[PDB]
Tab-separated table of N, CA, C and O in Angstrom:
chain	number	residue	atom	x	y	z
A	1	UNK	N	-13.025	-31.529	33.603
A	1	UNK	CA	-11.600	-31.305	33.758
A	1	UNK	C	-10.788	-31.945	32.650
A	1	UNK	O	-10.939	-33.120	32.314
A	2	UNK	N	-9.916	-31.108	32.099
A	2	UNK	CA	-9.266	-31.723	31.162
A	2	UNK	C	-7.768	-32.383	31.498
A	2	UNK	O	-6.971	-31.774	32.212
A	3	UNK	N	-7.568	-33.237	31.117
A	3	UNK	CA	-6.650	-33.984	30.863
A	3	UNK	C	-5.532	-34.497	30.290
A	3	UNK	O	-5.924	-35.440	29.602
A	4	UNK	N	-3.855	-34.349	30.155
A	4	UNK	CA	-3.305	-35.285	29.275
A	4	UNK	C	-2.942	-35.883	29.065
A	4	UNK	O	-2.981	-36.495	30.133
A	5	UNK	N	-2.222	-36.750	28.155
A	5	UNK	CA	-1.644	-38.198	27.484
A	5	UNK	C	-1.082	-38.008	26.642
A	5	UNK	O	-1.117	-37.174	25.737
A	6	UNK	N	-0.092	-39.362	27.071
A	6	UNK	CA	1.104	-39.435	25.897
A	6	UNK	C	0.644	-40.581	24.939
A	6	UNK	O	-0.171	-41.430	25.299
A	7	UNK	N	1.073	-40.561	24.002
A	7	UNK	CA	0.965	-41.231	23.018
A	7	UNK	C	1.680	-42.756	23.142
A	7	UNK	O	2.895	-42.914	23.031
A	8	UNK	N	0.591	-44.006	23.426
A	8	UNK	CA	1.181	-45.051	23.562
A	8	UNK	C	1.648	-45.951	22.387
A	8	UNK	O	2.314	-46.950	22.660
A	9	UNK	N	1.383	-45.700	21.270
A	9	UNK	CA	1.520	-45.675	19.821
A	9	UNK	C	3.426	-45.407	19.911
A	9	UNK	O	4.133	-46.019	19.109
A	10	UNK	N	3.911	-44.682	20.706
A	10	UNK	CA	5.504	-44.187	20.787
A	10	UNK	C	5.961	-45.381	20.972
A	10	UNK	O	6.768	-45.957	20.241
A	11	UNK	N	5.082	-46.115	22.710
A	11	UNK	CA	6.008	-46.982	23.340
A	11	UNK	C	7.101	-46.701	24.192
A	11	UNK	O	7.909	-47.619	24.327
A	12	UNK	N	7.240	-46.007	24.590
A	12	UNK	CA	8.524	-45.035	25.470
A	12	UNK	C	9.295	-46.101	25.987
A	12	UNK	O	8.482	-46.850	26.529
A	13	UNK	N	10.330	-46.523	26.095
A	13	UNK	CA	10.790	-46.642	27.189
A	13	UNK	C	12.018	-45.969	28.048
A	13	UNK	O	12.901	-45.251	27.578
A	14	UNK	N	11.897	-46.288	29.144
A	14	UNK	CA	12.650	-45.644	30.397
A	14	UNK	C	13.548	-46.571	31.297
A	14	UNK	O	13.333	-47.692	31.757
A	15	UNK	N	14.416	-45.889	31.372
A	15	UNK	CA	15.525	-44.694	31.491
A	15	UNK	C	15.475	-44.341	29.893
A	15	UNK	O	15.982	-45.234	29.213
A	16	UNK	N	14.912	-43.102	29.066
A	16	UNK	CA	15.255	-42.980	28.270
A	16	UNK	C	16.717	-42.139	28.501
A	16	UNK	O	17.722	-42.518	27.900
A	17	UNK	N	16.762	-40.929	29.450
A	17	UNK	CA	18.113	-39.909	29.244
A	17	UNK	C	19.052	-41.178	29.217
A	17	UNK	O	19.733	-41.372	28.210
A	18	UNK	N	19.127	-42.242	30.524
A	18	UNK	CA	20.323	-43.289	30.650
A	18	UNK	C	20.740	-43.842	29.258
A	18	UNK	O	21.886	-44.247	29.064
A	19	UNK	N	20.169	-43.846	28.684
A	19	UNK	CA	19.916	-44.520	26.864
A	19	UNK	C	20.922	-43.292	25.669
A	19	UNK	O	21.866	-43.516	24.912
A	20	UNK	N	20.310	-42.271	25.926
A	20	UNK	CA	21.536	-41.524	25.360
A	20	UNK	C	22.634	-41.114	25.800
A	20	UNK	O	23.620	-40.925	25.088
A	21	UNK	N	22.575	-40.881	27.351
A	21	UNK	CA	23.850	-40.744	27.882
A	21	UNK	C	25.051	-41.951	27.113
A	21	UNK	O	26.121	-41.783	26.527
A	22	UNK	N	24.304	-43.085	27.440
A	22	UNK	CA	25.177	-44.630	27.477
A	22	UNK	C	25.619	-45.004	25.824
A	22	UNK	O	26.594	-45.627	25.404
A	23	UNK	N	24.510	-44.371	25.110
A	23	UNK	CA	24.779	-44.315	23.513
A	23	UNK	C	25.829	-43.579	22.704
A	23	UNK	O	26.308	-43.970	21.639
A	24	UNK	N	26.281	-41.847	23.708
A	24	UNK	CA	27.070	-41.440	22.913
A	24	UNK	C	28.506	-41.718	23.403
A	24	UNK	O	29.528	-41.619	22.723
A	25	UNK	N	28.380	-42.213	25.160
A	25	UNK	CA	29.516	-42.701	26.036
A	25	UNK	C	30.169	-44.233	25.139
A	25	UNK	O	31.358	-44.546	25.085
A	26	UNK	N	29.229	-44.852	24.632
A	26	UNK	CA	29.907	-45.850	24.412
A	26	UNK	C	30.487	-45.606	22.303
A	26	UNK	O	31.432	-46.246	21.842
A	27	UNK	N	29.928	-44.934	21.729
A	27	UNK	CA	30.303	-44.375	20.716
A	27	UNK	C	31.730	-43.496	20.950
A	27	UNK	O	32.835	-43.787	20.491
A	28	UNK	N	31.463	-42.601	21.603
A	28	UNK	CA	32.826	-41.803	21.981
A	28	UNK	C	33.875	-42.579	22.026
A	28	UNK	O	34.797	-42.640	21.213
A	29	UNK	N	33.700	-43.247	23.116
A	29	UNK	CA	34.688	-44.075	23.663
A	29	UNK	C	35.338	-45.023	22.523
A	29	UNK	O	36.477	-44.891	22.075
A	30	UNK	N	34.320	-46.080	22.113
A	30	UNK	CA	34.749	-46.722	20.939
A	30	UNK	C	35.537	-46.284	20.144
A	30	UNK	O	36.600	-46.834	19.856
A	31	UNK	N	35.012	-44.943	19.551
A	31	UNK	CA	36.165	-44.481	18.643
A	31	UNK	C	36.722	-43.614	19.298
A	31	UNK	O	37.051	-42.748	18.487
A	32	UNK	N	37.037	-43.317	20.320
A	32	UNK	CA	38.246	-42.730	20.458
A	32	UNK	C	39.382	-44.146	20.349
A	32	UNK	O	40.359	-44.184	19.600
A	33	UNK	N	39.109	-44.838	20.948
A	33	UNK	CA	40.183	-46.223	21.342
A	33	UNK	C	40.504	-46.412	20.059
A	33	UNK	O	41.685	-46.221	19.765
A	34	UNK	N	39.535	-46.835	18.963
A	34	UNK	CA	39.409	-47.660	17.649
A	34	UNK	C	40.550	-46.713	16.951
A	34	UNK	O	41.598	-47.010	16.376
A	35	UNK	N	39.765	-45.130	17.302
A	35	UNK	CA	40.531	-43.893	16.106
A	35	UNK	C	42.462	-44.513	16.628
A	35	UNK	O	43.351	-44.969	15.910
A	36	UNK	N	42.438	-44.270	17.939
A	36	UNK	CA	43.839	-44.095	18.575
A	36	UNK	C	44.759	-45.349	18.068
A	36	UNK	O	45.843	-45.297	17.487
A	37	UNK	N	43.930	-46.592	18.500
A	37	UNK	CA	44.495	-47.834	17.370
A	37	UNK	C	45.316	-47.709	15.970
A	37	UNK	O	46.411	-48.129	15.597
A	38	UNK	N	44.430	-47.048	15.453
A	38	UNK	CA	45.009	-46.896	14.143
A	38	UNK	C	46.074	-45.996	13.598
A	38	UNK	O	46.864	-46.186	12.673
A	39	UNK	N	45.846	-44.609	14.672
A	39	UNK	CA	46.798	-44.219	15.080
A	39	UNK	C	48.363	-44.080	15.134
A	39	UNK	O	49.304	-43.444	14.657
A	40	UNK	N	48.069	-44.996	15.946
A	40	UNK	CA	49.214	-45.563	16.290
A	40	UNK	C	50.201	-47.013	15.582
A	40	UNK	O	49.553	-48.039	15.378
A	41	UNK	N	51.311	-47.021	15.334
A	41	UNK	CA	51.554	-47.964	14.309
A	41	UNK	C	53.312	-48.188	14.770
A	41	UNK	O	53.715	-47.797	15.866
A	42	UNK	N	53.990	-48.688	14.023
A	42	UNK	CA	55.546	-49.184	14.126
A	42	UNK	C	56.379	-48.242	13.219
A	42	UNK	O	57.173	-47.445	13.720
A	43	UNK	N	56.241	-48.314	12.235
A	43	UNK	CA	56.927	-47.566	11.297
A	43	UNK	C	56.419	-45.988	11.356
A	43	UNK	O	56.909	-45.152	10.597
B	1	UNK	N	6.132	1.938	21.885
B	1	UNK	CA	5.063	1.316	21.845
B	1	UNK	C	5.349	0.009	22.576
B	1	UNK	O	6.363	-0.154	23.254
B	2	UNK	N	4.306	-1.009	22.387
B	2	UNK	CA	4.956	-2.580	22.456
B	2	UNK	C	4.615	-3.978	21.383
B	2	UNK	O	3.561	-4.105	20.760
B	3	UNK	N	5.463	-4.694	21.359
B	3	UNK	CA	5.821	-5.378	20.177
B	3	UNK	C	5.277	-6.581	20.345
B	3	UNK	O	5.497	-6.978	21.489
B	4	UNK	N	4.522	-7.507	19.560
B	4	UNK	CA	4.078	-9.032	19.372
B	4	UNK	C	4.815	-10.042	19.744
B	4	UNK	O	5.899	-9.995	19.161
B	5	UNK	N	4.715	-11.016	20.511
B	5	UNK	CA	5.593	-11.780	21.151
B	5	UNK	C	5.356	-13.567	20.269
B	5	UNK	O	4.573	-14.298	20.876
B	6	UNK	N	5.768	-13.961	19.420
B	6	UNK	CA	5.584	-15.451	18.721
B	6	UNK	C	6.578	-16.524	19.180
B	6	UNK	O	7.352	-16.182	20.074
B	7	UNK	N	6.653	-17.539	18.790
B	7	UNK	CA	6.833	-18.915	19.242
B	7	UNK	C	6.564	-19.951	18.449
B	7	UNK	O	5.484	-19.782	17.884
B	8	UNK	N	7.235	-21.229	18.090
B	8	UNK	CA	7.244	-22.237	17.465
B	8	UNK	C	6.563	-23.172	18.637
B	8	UNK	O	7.208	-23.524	19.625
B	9	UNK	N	5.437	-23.471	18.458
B	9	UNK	CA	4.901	-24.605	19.554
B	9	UNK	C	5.312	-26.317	18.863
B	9	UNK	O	5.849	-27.313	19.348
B	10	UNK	N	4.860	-26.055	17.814
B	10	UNK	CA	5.371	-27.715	17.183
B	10	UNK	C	6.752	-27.872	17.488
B	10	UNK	O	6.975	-28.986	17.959
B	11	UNK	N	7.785	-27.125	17.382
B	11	UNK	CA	8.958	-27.015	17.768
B	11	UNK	C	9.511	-28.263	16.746
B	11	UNK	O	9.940	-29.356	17.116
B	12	UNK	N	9.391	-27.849	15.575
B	12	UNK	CA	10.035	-29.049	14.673
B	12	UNK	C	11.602	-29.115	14.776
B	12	UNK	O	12.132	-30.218	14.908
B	13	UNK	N	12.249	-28.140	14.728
B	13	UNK	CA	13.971	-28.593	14.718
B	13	UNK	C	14.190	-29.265	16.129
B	13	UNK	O	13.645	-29.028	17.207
B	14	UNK	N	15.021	-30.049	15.830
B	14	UNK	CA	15.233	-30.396	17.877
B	14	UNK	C	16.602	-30.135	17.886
B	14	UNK	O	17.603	-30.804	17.628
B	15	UNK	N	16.374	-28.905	18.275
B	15	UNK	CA	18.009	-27.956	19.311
B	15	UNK	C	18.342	-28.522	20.688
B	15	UNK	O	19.481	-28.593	21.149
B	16	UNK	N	17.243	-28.910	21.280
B	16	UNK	CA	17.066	-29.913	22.769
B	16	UNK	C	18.346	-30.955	22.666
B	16	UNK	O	19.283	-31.164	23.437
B	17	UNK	N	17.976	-31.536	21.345
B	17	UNK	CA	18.930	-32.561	21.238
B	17	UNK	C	20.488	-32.806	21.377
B	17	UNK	O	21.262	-33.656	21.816
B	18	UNK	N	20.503	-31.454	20.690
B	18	UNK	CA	21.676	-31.152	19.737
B	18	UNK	C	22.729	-30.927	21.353
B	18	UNK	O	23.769	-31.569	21.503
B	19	UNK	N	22.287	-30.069	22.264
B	19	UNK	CA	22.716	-29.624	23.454
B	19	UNK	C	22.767	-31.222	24.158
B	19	UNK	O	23.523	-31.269	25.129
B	20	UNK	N	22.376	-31.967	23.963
B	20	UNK	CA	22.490	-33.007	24.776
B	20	UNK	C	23.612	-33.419	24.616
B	20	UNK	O	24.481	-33.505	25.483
B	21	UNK	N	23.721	-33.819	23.071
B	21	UNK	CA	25.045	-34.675	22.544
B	21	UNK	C	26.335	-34.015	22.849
B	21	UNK	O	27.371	-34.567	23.219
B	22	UNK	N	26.093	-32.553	22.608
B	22	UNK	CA	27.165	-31.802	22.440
B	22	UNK	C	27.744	-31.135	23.759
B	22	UNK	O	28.722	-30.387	23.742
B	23	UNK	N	26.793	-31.604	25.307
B	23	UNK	CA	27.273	-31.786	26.362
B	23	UNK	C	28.136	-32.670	26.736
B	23	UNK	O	29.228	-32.560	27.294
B	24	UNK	N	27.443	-33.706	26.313
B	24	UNK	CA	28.320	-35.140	26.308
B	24	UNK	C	29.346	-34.978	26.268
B	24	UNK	O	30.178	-35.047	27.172
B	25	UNK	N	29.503	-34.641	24.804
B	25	UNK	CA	30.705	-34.678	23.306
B	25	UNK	C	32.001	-33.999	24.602
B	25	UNK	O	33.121	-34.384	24.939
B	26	UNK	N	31.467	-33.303	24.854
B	26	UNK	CA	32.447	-31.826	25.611
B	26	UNK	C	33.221	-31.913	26.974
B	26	UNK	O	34.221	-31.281	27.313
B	27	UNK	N	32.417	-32.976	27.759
B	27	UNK	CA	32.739	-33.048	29.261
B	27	UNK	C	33.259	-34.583	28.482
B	27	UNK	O	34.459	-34.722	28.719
B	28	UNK	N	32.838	-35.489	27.829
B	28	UNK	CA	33.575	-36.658	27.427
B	28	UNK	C	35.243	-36.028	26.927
B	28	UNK	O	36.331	-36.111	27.497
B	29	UNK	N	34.963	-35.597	26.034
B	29	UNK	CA	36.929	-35.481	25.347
B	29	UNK	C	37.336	-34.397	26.292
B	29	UNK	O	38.527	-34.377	26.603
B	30	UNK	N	36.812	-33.800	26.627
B	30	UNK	CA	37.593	-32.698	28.052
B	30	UNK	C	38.011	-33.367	28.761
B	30	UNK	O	39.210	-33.192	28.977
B	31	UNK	N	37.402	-34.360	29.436
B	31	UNK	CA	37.612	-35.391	30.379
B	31	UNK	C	39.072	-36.408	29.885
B	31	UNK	O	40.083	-36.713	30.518
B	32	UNK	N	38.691	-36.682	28.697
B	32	UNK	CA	39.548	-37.767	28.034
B	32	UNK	C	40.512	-37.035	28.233
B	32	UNK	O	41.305	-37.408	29.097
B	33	UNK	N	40.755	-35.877	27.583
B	33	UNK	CA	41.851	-35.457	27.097
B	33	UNK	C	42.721	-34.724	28.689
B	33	UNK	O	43.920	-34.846	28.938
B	34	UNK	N	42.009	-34.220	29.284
B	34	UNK	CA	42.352	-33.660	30.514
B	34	UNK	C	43.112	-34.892	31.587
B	34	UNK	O	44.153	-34.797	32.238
B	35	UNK	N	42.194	-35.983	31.477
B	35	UNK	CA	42.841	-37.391	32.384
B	35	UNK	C	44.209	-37.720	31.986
B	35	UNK	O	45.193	-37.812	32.720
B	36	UNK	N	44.121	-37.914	30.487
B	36	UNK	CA	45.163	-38.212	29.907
B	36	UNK	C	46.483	-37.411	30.139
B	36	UNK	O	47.554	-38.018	30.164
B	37	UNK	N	46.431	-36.196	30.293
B	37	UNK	CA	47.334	-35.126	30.343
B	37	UNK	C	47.815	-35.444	31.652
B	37	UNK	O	49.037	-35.513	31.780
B	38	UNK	N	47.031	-35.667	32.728
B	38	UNK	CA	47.829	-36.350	33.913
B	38	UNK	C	48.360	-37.933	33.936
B	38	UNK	O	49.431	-38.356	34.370
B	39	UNK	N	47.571	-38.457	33.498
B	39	UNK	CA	47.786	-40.009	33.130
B	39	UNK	C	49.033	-40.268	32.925
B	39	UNK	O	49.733	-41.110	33.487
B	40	UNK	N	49.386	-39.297	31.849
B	40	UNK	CA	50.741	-39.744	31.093
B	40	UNK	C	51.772	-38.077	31.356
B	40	UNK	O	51.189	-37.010	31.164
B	41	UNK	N	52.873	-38.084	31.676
B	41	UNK	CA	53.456	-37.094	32.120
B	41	UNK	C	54.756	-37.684	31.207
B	41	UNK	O	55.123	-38.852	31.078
B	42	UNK	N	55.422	-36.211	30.512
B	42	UNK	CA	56.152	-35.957	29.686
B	42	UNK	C	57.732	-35.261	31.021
B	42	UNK	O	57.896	-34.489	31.966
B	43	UNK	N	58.758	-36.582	29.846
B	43	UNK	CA	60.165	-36.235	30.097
B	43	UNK	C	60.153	-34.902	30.794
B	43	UNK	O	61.212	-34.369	31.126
């Protein structure tokens, strides 16, 4: 019977989806705030 | 007649990906921008 496997050479780790969800949520976010900062001004 | 059916198994480009971010990207500033539009209410 054959068999398969992942490659432990990768190292996976998990929650990987939670990892990109949280990567582009906190990128987004950042610059949206950062972009809007600058944005925004007095004069 | 009928026609040959092919496929990329290595699947080198990652389009997988691309749909991930660009889910994100989409329900994030939709979201942003949609909250905001109630958030803040104009004169």
């Amino acid at each position: 019977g054959s068999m398969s496997q992942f490659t432990c050479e990768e190292d996976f780790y998990f929650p990987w989806l939670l990892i990109i969800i949280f990567g582009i949520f906190g990128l987004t976010v950042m610059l949206f705030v950062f972009l809007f900062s600058k944005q925004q001004r007095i004069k």
